[PDB]
Every structure is written in C-alpha cells, then in structure tokens.
Amino acid sequence: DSSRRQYQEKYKQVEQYMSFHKLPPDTRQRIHDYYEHRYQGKMFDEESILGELSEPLREEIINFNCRKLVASMPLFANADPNFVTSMLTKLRFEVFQPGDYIIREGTIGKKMYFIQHGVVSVLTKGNKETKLADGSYFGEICLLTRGRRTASVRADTYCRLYSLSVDNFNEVLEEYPMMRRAFETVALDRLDRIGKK
Amino acid sequence: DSSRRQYQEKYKQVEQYMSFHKLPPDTRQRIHDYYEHRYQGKMFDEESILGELSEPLREEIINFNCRKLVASMPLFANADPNFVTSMLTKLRFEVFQPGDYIIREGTIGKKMYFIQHGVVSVLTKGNKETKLADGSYFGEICLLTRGRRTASVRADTYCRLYSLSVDNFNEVLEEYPMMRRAFETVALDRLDRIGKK
Amino acid sequence: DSSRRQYQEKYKQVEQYMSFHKLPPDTRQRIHDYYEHRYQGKMFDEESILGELSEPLREEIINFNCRKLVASMPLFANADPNFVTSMLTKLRFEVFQPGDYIIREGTIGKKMYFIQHGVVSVLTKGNKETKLADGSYFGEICLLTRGRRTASVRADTYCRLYSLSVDNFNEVLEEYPMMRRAFETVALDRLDRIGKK
Amino acid sequence: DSSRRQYQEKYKQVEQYMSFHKLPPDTRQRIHDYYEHRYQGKMFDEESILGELSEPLREEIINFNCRKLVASMPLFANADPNFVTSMLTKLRFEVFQPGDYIIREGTIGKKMYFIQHGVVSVLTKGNKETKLADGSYFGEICLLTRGRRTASVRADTYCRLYSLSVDNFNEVLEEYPMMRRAFETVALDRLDRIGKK
Ligand SMILES: Nc1ncnc2c1ncn2[C@@H]1O[C@@H]2COP(=O)(O)O[C@H]2[C@H]1O
Ligand SMILES: Nc1ncnc2c1ncn2[C@@H]1O[C@@H]2COP(=O)(O)O[C@H]2[C@H]1O
Ligand SMILES: Nc1ncnc2c1ncn2[C@@H]1O[C@@H]2COP(=O)(O)O[C@H]2[C@H]1O
Numbered sequence: 110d111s112s113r114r115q116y117q118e119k120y121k122q123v124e125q126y127m128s129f130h131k132l133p134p135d136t137r138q139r140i141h142d143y144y145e146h147r148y149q150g151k152m153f154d155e156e157s158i159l160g161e162l163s164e165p166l167r168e169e170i171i172n173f174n175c176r177k178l179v180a181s182m183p184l185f186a187n188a189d190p191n192f193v194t195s196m197l198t199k200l201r202f203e204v205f206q207p208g209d210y211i212i213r214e215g216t217i218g219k220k221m222y223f224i225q226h227g228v229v230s231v232l233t234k235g236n237k238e239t240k241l242a243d244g245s246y247f248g249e250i251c252l253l254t255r256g257r258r259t260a261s262v263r264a265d266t267y268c269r270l271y272s273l274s275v276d277n278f279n280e281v282l283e284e285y286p287m288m289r290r291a292f293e294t295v296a297l298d299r300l301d302r303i304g305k306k
Numbered sequence: 307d308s309s310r311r312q313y314q315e316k317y318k319q320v321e322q323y324m325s326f327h328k329l330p331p332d333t334r335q336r337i338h339d340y341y342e343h344r345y346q347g348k349m350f351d352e353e354s355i356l357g358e359l360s361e362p363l364r365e366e367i368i369n370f371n372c373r374k375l376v377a378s379m380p381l382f383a384n385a386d387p388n389f390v391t392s393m394l395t396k397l398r399f400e401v402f403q404p405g406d407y408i409i410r411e412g413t414i415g416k417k418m419y420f421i422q423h424g425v426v427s428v429l430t431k432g433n434k435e436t437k438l439a440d441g442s443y444f445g446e447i448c449l450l451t452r453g454r455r456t457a458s459v460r461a462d463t464y465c466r467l468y469s470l471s472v473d474n475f476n477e478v479l480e481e482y483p484m485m486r487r488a489f490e491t492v493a494l495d496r497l498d499r500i501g502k503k
Numbered sequence: 504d505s506s507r508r509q510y511q512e513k514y515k516q517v518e519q520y521m522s523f524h525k526l527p528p529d530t531r532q533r534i535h536d537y538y539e540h541r542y543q544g545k546m547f548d549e550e551s552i553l554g555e556l557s558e559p560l561r562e563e564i565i566n567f568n569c570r571k572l573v574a575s576m577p578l579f580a581n582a583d584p585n586f587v588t589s590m591l592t593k594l595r596f597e598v599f600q601p602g603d604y605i606i607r608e609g610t611i612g613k614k615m616y617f618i619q620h621g622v623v624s625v626l627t628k629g630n631k632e633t634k635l636a637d638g639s640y641f642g643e644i645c646l647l648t649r650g651r652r653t654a655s656v657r658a659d660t661y662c663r664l665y666s667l668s669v670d671n672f673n674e675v676l677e678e679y680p681m682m683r684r685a686f687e688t689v690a691l692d693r694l695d696r697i698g699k700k
Numbered sequence: 701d702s703s704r705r706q707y708q709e710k711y712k713q714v715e716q717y718m719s720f721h722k723l724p725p726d727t728r729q730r731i732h733d734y735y736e737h738r739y740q741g742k743m744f745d746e747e748s749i750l751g752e753l754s755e756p757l758r759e760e761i762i763n764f765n766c767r768k769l770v771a772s773m774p775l776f777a778n779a780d781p782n783f784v785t786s787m788l789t790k791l792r793f794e795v796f797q798p799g800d801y802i803i804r805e806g807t808i809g810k811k812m813y814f815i816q817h818g819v820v821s822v823l824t825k826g827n828k829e830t831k832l833a834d835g836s837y838f839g840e841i842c843l844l845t846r847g848r849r850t851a852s853v854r855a856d857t858y859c860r861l862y863s864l865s866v867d868n869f870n871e872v873l874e875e876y877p878m879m880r881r882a883f884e885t886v887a888l889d890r891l892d893r894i895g896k897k
C-alpha cells in the first residue's frame with residue numbers, strides 16, 4: 110500500500126535523475142541494486158515514526174530490531190542491557206556493495222561500524238590481511254586515538270552495517286566508562302598484529 | 307476533517323512499519339495505546355502553527371493551555387507571571403505508559419519533568435521509596451549538580467509530563483536568578499531524605 | 504490560485520487547533536486578526552523561493568521590497584548601499600498587535616527592531632515615556648551592552664517590524680565597523696535621557 | 701514527467717511571489733532567466749536522492765558529474781583521486797548572471813569558487829584587471845589569510861560555479877595537508893601581481 114508506493118515513487122525520481130545526468134549503465138545498475146538491497150521495495154520515515162514515540166517505546170522497538178545483532182556480539186551479550194540499549198539508539202543503518210571501500214587508510218575516521226550481516230576485508234596494506242564477519246565491528250581505533258585509519262576495509266559482499274559516530278561513541282562511554290576497556294583491549298590487540306600497542 | 311485524517315493516515319504508516327519489522331503483538335499494542343493517549347485521534351503541526359504566530363500570541367496560547375498545570379504548582383502560582391510564561395514556552399509535552407522508566411539512576415540526566423497528570427514512583431534503590439503526582443516535578447537535581455540521577459522514576463499510570471532541558475533550564479534562571487533557590491531548596495531537601503545536603 | 508489556497512488551507516488547520524484546545528473567542532479573534540494582517544490571504548515559502556535564487560538576485564529583490572523602509576531611515580539613506588543590503592538580508596519580518604509587548608524591561612534582549620510601519624510606546628518605567636514611528640528602530644542598547652532591556656516597548660497599533668538578532672548584528676558590524684558609532688551615538692543619547700551615558 | 705512538473709509547479713509559485721511584491725519586469729526577467737539557466741526545466745531533490753545513497757555511490761556519481769570540470773583543472777588532474785573526490789563532495793553548484801558580482805573587495809570572504817563554465821573579471825580596483833575562465837578558481841586568498849577580498853569578481857557571462865566554504869576547505873586540507881601548498885603558490889603568486897607576497 111502506502112510504503113510500497115512511497116518506494117516505487119521515490120525510485121522513479123531516482124531513475125529520472127540518472128537519465129538527466131546520463132550516468133553509465135555500469136553505474137545505474139549499482140544504484141538500482143543498492144536501492145533493492147537497502148529498501149526491499151518499501152520506504153518508511155523512521156525519523157518521523159520513531160520521533161513520534163516515547164523514548165521507552167523507541168528502546169523497546171530498537172532492542173527488538175537488533176536482538177539478533179546483539180546475540181552475535183560478545184561486546185553486548187554480557188554487558189549491562191542499558192549500555193546496549195544506549196548504543197543501539199545511536200547507531201545508523203548503512204548498506205555497502207561488493208567491492209565498496211567502507212574505510213580508507215591514512216584517512217581521518219570519525220565513526221565505527223558493527224557488522225550485522227556480511228564479510229569485509231581488512232587490507233592493512235603490506236601483508237597479513239584479515240576478514241571480519243557478522244557480529245564483528247571495526248573502525249574503533251580512530252575513535253580512541255583520534256588519528257588515522259590503520260587499514261582499509263572493503264565489502265566482499267553486500268554488507269549490512271550500523272555505524273556509530275565519534276560523538277555518540279564518547280557520549281556512551283561517558284555514561285558507561287567501564288566499557289571503554291572492552292574497546293581498548295580489542296584495539297591494542299589489533300594494533301599489535303601490525304604496529305601500535 | 308483534516309486533523310483526524312492526518313492522524314489515521316499517520317497511524318496507518320505506523321501500523322505498516324510494525325508489520326514489516328514483525329514486532330510482537332505484545333509491543334504493537336503498547337504502540338497503539340501510546341498513540342491513542344498521546345494524540346486522541348487528531349494530529350497537528352504545532353511547530354508550524356505556533357511558528358507562524360507572533361511571540362505574544364504563542365505566550366497567550368501556551369499560558370492558557372497550561373493554566374491548570376500552573377494552578378497546581380506552588381513553584382508557579384506565586385511567581386512572576388513572566389517567569390512562568392518563560393518556562394512554559396520551553397517545555398515539551400511527553401506521554402509515558404504504566405511501567406515505563408522515565409529516569410534511571412546512575413544515568414546522566416539532561417532534562418527535568420513537571421507532572422501535568424499522573425503518578426510516578428521514585429524508587430531510590432535501597433529503601434524509602436516515594437510517590438509524586440499532578441503538580442509535582444522531578445529530575446532537577448542533575449540540572450543543578452550536573453551529576454547522575456539519584457533515583458529512578460517509573461510511571462505507575464499513564465503520565466502526561468512536560469520536560470525541560472538543561473539548556474532551557476539554565477537560560478531561564480539566567481534571566482530570573484531569584485528562582486534558582488526555589489529549586490535548590492526542594493533539591494537539597496530531597497537529597498537530605500537520602501544522601502546529599 | 505496556489506498562494507491563496509495555501510493560506511486558506513493553513514488558516515483552516517489553525518482554526519481546528521483553536522477548537523481542539525477550546526481557546527477563548529477573546530483569543531481566537533486575536534489569532535484570526537493576526538493571520539489577516541500578517542499574510543493578507545496569501546501564504547508563500549520565502550525560505551524555498553529565496554533559497555533557490557542566487558545571492559545577487561536575493562539582494563536585488565530584498566532591496567526592492569524594503570526600498571521604502573530604507574528611504575525613511577537616516578541610518579541607511581546615507582550609508583554605503585552594501586552595508587544596507589547586508590543588513591536587509593539578515594532581517595526577519597514580524598507583525599505585532601495593538602497592546603502587545605514587543606520588549607520587556609529587565610529582560611535579556613537578543614535582537615533589535617526596525618519599524619517599517621506602526622507606532623510603539625517606550626514606557627521606560629518611572630516617567631518620561633516616548634513614542635517611536637515608521638523609520639525608527641529600537642532594542643539596540645542590549646545588542647551593544649549585552650545587559651538588560653532599559654525600557655518596555657508596546658505596540659500602540661498594528662506594527663510591521665523587521666528584527667535583527669545579536670548574531671547578525673555583530674556579523675554586519677564586523678564587516679562594516681564604521682557603522683557601530685551610528686548605533687552607539689543614538690544609544691548613549693537614549694541612555695542620557697534616562698541613566699546610562 | 702515528475703521532474704518537469706516539479707519545476708513548472710515551482711516556477712509557478714515564483715511567478716506569483718513576484719506579482720504579489722510587484723517587482724519591476726526589469727527584475728522578473730532576470731529571475732526568469734536565472735531559473736532557466738539553473739534548472740533547465742527539471743527540478744530534483746539532490747539532498748534527498750543523494751542522501752539516500754551510500755557514500756561510495758555518491759562519490760561515484762559526483763566524480764562522474766564533474767569529470768569534465770576535473771579534466772580542465774591542473775589542481776586536480778595530477779592529484780590523488782581521493783583528494784579530488786573529497787573536494788567534489790563538499791562543493792555546491794551556483795549559477796551567476798552577466799554583470800552579477802560574485803565577490804566584493806574589502807568584504808570578508810568565507811568561500812571560494814571553481815569555474816565549471818563561464819568567464820569572470822577580476823577587477824582589482826586601481827588597474828591591471830584580469831579574466832579567468834573554465835577550469836580556473838578564485839576566492840582562495842581569504843580562505844588562507846582570513847582577511848578581506850583583494851579584488852572584485854564579476855560575471856561577464858552566465859557562469860556555472862562550484863563554491864567551497866572555509867569550513868570544508870580546512871577540513872579537506874586537514875586530511876590532505878600536502879595540497880595546501882598548491883593553493884598557497886597560486887595565492888602568493890596572485891598577491892605579487894598586486895600587493896601581498
Ligand atoms: N588486524 C586487524 N584485525 C581486525 N581488524 C582490524 C585490524 N587492524 C585494523 N582493524 C580495523 O580496521 C580499522 C581501520 O580503521 P581504524 O584505524 O579506526 O580501526 C581499525 C580496526 O577496527
Ligand atoms: N526523596 C525524594 N522525593 C521526591 N523526589 C525525589 C527524591 N529523591 C529524588 N527525587 C527526584 O528524582 C530525581 C532523579 O533524578 P535527579 O537526580 O536529576 O532528580 C531527582 C529528584 O528530582
Ligand atoms: N528615551 C528613549 N527613546 C527612544 N528609545 C528608547 C529610549 N530608551 C530606550 N529606548 C529603546 O528601548 C529599548 C529597550 O531595549 P534595549 O535596552 O535593548 O534598547 C532600548 C532602546 O532602543
């Protein structure tokens with residue numbers, strides 16, 4: 110009904126823009142596939158729907174929509190449920206296509222990612238590359254150091270991620286200081302397999 | 307007419323989102339009841355309507371819509387009417403359901419609440435719990451200390467509240483410094499029945 | 504056509520809100536009259552229309568819409584036309600009703616006003632009250648001192664004003680420092696007829 | 701279809717506003733011509749379309765839409781493609797009419813421009829005026845000095861520009877410090893033909 114019509118109407122607008130700007134069909138297709146994998150044919154207004162609810166109801170809905178992501182992630186599964194809820198509310202859903210570069214080395218990161226579904230390559234230049242999958246996260250090192258990306262991260266497949274900005278990261282750890290160490294440990298651990306400590 | 311249609315059309319959108327995300331009927335019902343108690347079947351655009359009026363007209367409307375809340379509250383009833391008007395303009399209407407946690411201990415509060423209608427439990431961990439009702443307020447302690455919630459507050463029933471952010475709190479007291487003491491007194495008084503002073 | 508329909512449709516929404524909140528007809532009328540005097544039956548989207556034009560075109564339109572206000576005001580008529588244009592772009596149109604209080608003493612002003620059309624009383628408590636009309640401005644003292652309103656200002660009639668915020672005030676004088684003195688002179692002059700210097 | 705209808709509907713609104721404010725046909729025409737040259741009869745919602753895509757897809761689209769601008773500009777053609785992409789994302793499309801003043805001397809610039817198509821006169825008061833065309837840029841001096849415009853710049857013809865704000869300028873050079881010198885060189889070089897060094 111109203112959701113499907115909101116999508117096909119918006120996809121329509123997108124299909125016109127591509128034509129006006131005469132984009133390569135090499136590109137229009139990526140755009141088309143992105144739209145499928147991101148919306149599945151139904152477009153809502155989360156900002157509006159969720160903005161119109163009380164905070165307790167948002168937390169109940171968000172905790173449910175992410176119950177599976179939470180169950181796969183050691184960081185959460187054993188944490189205070191209020192820490193978890195406080196992080197889920199600050200995350201933003203992002204989809205990434207096979208080949209896409211989620212993060213670039215040398216760059217100045219301002220956000221991290223939690224993998225809901227998909228596989229990503231951590232090409233840490235030189236050698237000793239790595240793969241992370243569902244339940245893992247990355248991009249935290251810059252949120253702690255405030256330096257530059259230690260590696261690059263490329264979608265091997267369609268990824269569903271949840272990003273968290275440095276602002277929201279520090280705001281959560283301000284409230285739950287205990288949980289910083291959980292991040293530090295995995296960070297310094299990851300830096301050891303490279304150059305950091 | 308246009309208000310009712312705006313509601314049932316928006317509630318429609320909400321009912322779809324719930325289905326797409328396959329929420330427990332245990333949850334869909336809470337959402338449904340929330341929507342009833344919050345909108346009563348008519349949805350307006352306060353930001354637009356009120357934004358389109360002069361400041362004097364907003365104050366006249368807001369003072370009238372809150373005349374009853376003002377009459378129940380000792381803080382206001384005896385204060386400079388301009389202090390009162392200046393606070394009413396900064397408040398935000400919030401509804402909370404039976405059982406909901408309005409505030410959590412240990413947490414870093416950034417806003418307080420004034421009860422228009424309803425009853426809330428101040429479970430101050432340990433013992434000596436308390437009940438506040440229509441005309442009372444809470445959550446001011448963190449606005450003064452800038453520390454953490456001294457207790458938890460749970461809706462015993464459907465609550466209608468008006469929240470005030472720390473920013474707007476300090477902005478009002480900047481203009482009406484005399485009124486800080488009224489808040490301090492009730493605060494230090496509340497801290498005594500616990501641990502504060 | 505589209506403008507008139509946008510107004511009567513929005514006024515419709517306003518008429519419903521008043522009914523829902525059961526406002527005194529003493530108030531609904533003020534609201535109704537305000538809407539007439541502010542929109543004249545046609546509602547546009549300045550933010551959209553003007554936002555869609557180049558800066559030079561905005562300045563040309565704004566200079567024309569305010570040519571009469573500019574001609575009545577000694578501050579402008581003899582100033583660099585670029586100073587003038589730079590001020591006009593930052594102003595915001597405001598209508599005020601007979602009896603309305605535009606400014607209150609003791610209060611912390613963050614904006615000034617230029618009278619396009621109407622008469623206002625500067626009731627400086629005590630005695631020696633004053634009247635300002637088309638082409639005059641007021642509320643500058645707090646923009647300079649950063650203190651409190653030295654008097655109150657009440658609409659004797661329907662006023663059409665243009666307000667300027669302290670931010671935009673200081674931003675203009677940052678570019679045209681010479682013009683501060685023009686404001687200071689009238690300010691210190693106004694303070695002398697009271698208490699300031 | 702939907703784009704053309706969005707334009708002619710919005711142009712309609714514009715044509716009414718002009719009439720309501722009784723603008724000189726000397727002005728209505730400039731407005732009309734501006735609208736043609738800026739939209740070409742089709743209006744989209746870039747903020748919405750582009751906001752709904754992943755960052756990698758935006759970069760792919762933006763790099764393509766600006767491939768020609770990039771090919772004409774020595775600054776880019778030889779730079780790290782990621783520096784280039786990082787600048788393109790921050791630019792804003794602006795059209796300017798024959799005679800328009802893009803920049804005024806003595807003024808406090810907060811943005812620079814890259815010429816996609818058109819010719820502009822750098823009237824540096826006094827004497828020794830200059831012309832810049834497709835592929836050139838200007839307005840960088842204030843982004844570096846944080847002072848005032850060294851000259852004025854006037855559209856000799858319809859210009860298509862891309863502006864970059866001081867905020868985005870410093871944010872890019874923060875990530876790609878090497879590229880500051882490329883700007884400094886052309887800047888100090890331009891200052892020499894005048895007064896700067
Ligand atoms: N050896 C590794 N194993 C897994 N993830 C890594 C490794 N090295 C770096 N990363 C992740 O890659 C990210 C690149 O951006 P950050 O430096 O902010 O954070 C880095 C880590 O989260
Ligand atoms: N003994 C008490 N009686 C009533 N209210 C209380 C009592 N103790 C705490 N509160 C309220 O509970 C709030 C919890 O958050 P705050 O600490 O910011 O502010 C606290 C008070 O407003
Ligand atoms: N004697 C006066 N004559 C005219 N205007 C005045 C006089 N005294 C005060 N005002 C205006 O009234 C304003 C009240 O707010 P401000 O103090 O910011 O600025 C003040 C002046 O602009």
Ligand SMILES: Nc1ncnc2c1ncn2[C@@H]1O[C@@H]2COP(=O)(O)O[C@H]2[C@H]1O
Nearest residue numbers: 809830838839840841842849850851890
């Ligand atoms: N001699 C010149 N040749 C080309 N461009 C110039 C010259 N002098 C000034 N400009 C440009 O004109 C701009 C005016 O604003 P800015 O001072 O910020 O930056 C200046 C330069 O980019």
